[PDB]
Design a protein around this ligand. Structure first.
Ligand SMILES: CC(=O)Nc1cc(C)[nH]n1
Length: 175
């Protein structure tokens, strides 16, 4: 039962113009089986457009490749990002590259360690902000988590569900 291809693809920006389908493949095959690997080129000149994409056989292989950043490919540090799987209707096909999530539906009994214990397995956490009422100090039932890197957030928002402290949470990219 293969994972959807869109969830196995990595857009690679910042390519050296000398990178080819073949050299990009030789690099990224170190972290998994590549079912697809293509450098974007101009249709007339064949000059590289400076980016491309690779598709792994599994999501765990995508994880392995992201955990092996920074990637220096043909002498240049590149910028891999997971494919846009849920677009912003106003900015079709654009990656919203942020390090912060909104976490809603945690009610008043969810504390910092609940969120840390869960989200630390997606990435390195820098800030956890449990929101409280400006007048009363009561918890408002949502929080923001800031990570040191965008891929944590990308992994988080492509999941269908997040269960934290027994709550079914709503999670989205923030700011
Ligand atoms: C707007 C935006 O960044 N959407 C995304 C990103 C990923 C990995 N899935 N969906």
């Amino acid at each position: 039962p293969k994972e959807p291809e869109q969830l196995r693809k990595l857009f690679i920006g910042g390519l050296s113009f000398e990178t080819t389908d073949e050299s990009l493949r030789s690099h990224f095959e170190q972290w998994g089986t590549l079912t697809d690997c293509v450098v974007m080129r101009d249709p007339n000149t064949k000059r590289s457009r400076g980016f491309g994409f690779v598709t792994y056989a599994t999501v765990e292989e995508v994880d392995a490749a992201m955990n092996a950043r920074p990637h220096k490919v043909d002498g240049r540090v590149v910028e891999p990002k997971r494919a846009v799987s849920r677009e912003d209707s106003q900015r079709p096909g654009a990656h919203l590259t942020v390090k912060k999530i909104f976490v809603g539906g945690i009610k008043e009994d969810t504390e910092e360690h609940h969120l840390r214990d869960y989200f630390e397995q997606y990435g390195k956490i820098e800030v956890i902000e449990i929101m409280t009422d400006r007048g009363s100090g009561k918890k408002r039932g949502f929080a923001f988590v800031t990570f040191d890197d965008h891929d944590s957030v990308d992994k988080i928002v492509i999941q269908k569900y997040h269960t934290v402290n027994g709550h079914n949470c709503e999670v989205r990219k923030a700011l």
